[PDB]
Amino acid sequence: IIGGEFTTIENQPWFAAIYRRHRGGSVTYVCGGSLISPCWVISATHCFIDYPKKEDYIVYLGRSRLNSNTQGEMKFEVENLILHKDYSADTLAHHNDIALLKIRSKEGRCAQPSRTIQTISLPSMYNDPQFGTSCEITGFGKENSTDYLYPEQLKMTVVKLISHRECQQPHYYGSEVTTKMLCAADPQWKTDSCQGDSGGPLVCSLQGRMTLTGIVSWGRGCALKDKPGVYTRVSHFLPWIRSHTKE
Numbered sequence: 001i002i003g004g005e006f007t008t009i010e011n012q013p014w015f016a017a018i019y020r021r022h023r024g025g026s027v028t029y030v031c032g033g034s035l036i037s038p039c040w041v042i043s044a045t046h047c048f049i050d051y052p053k054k055e056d057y058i059v060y061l062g063r064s065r066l067n068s069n070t071q072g073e074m075k076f077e078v079e080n081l082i083l084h085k086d087y088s089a090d091t092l093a094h095h096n097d098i099a100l101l102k103i104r105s106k107e108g109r110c111a112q113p114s115r116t117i118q119t120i121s122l123p124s125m126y127n128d129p130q131f132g133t134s135c136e137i138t139g140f141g142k143e144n145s146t147d148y149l150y151p152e153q154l155k156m157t158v159v160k161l162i163s164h165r166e167c168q169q170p171h172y173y174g175s176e177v178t179t180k181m182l183c184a185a186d187p188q189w190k191t192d193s194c195q196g197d198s199g200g201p202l203v204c205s206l207q208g209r210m211t212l213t214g215i216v217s218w219g220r221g222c223a224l225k226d227k228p229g230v231y232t233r234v235s236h237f238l239p240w241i242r243s244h245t246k247e
Ligand SMILES: NCCOc1c(Cl)cc(C(=O)O)cc1Cl
Pocket: 046, 192, 193, 194, 195, 196, 197, 198, 216, 217, 218, 219, 220, 221, 222, 223, 228, 229, 230
């Protein structure tokens, strides 16, 4: 996250921190994710497509710091790693950039809700806030494009939804942005998602209720004028979500 503020998991209790274990034993941060039910975290396919082996992953919930422990945090393995069959990446755009991680403790259980661990609601079918709506993003992503390390503390910021018409101007992203994606940005171009924020939530208060409207997906640079953050439009993937979380 460029700009915004440091935050704690109690403010974003659906946030999931997703790591990968390497041969040798080192663990690196991969991407964010969001708990949508006790057994399920939703994230982005581009995060996993080069290393699709579920055994390589570690998922934390209730965690506020990148490489240290938080009281009440819970650690999970990935029981099933579901990537979208139709995922693709062009020069800039990722398409169908959505993944599901079925999580379980070492004891075989799903998450236990607490004050620092909670599910976030899915939107209803094609139900998105109007452009101009303020929504929040959360992640451990870069604070500046020049950074090579991620922040140690979780961050959040607020961005506004940008119309498709605005986002599809040739000097924005033209027709690379599709109907299955949402753009969001800062009107003054000072705050944004950045590398490392992928997979994490874009949350909007929708009909008075906190809703997973988007998933951090792609963009050109970070907090660059005329280049909004691009998000998987969750409400266009409900059948996919439902079918893979059924069985
Ligand atoms: N400012 C939105 C674009 O931020 C990024 C970047 Cl710089 C890289 C990646 C990546 O996949 O490396 C993803 C996002 Cl959302």
